[PDB]
Amino acid sequence: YHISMINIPAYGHVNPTLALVEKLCEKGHRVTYATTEEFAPAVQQAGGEALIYEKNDAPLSLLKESLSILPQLEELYKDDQPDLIIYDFVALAGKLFAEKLNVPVIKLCSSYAQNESFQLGNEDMLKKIREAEAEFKEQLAVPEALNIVFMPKSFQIQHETFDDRFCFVGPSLGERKEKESLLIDKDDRPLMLISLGTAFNAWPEFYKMCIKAFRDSSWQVIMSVGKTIDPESLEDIPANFTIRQSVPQLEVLEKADLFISHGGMNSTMEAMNAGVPLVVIPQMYEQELTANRVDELGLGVYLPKEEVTVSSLQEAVQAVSSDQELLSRVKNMQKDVKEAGGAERAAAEIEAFMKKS
Ligand code: NA
């Protein structure tokens, strides 16, 4: 089939999709992958053909912009047409389009999936409610006949309530050759990864606090600071630290013993796939959920931003990295992450979805 998968312009949502695109073309089908040009090159590598086409601090009304991409993307509606369209759950436009074309739909859940019995967001978030109705042409995100969730089922909140419409394939990570090549003997020195990723780009005191907390400690520390800070700015970088704007995460996680992260779903599932315990410091609401989920599942510790100190970072790292039972549960969750089936099982469920008709 000619498959069209519609996704928003955000890195977090597109990585899980790429490995699926890679698997699909291996199975034979062809994808038109609508995306913003910035995101176009990553699409190409895994195969498929995607034809190209801000800040989220504001509280409501983001879709219309997604309604603006609906026509822009729908210009190609006519030239090549789908037999199956897959849309990221946030990218509303793909359904509208899809509804109009009455093609089978498959929803992508980058983040937790929800069902009638279980919903996401607090009452305050809940309270906003699709208030203004404009003039053109129900519930914003219900479940499609088949929804692929990029996490093991055991990680899903209220996983008991979830249907056969929901396939929990875990993170979609392929098999690839390491960019990192980080090599010297470890020395048996525990490797800590610190990355807040995209969030907290305005909090340089955090990275300074990490340096103060762990300089000249038993740990070896890799700290991805993004452009939040500039490595040269600091007076003295400790010998046991390695500070970059970016690092190959999957790579370092496979050699790490602890991961201080921001609770992004991609970063969390990668840590789970590598079986690395977590200290989660969340910024956005979804991260707060993931941070809570990590805590309740016993996979690590949830360190709220308002409590992050030199001491709290040390205390957290020490508690986590010293709890062997926590390491076991992390291992058990890693095992679930691999059994989840990945892009392989995701692709298979799409093909078997098409036989049903
Ligand atoms: Na807590």
Curated annotation (Swiss-Prot):
Its EC number is 2.4.1.384. GO terms for biological process: antibiotic biosynthetic process. Activity is improved in the presence of Mn(2+), Mg(2+) and Ca(2+), and inhibited by Ni(2+), Zn(2+) and Cu(2+). This is NDP-glycosyltransferase YjiC. It catalyses: an NDP-glycose + an acceptor = a glycosylated acceptor + NDP. Changing S110A: No change in activity. Dramatic reduction of the catalytic efficiency and glycosylation levels. InterPro entries: EryCIII-like_C, Glycosyltransferase_28, UDP_glucos_trans, UDPGT_MGT-like. Monomer. The lineage of its organism: Bacteria, Bacillati, Bacillota, Bacilli, Bacillales. Changing E270A: Strong decrease in activity for both pterostilbene glycosylation and UDP glycosylation. Adopts the classical GT-B fold containing the N-terminal and C-terminal domains that accommodate the sugar acceptor and UDP-glucose, respectively. The spacious sugar-acceptor binding pocket might be responsible for the broad substrate spectrum. UDP binds at N15, T198, S224, V247, H262, N266, S267, T268, M269, E270. Optimum temperature is 30-40 degrees Celsius. Optimum pH is approximately 8.0. Gene3D superfamilies: Glycogen Phosphorylase B. Keywords: Glycosyltransferase, Transferase. Changing S246F: Significantly enhances the UDP glycosylation efficiency, but shows unchanged or reduced pterostilbene glycosylation when supplied with UDP-glucose and ADP-glucose, respectively.
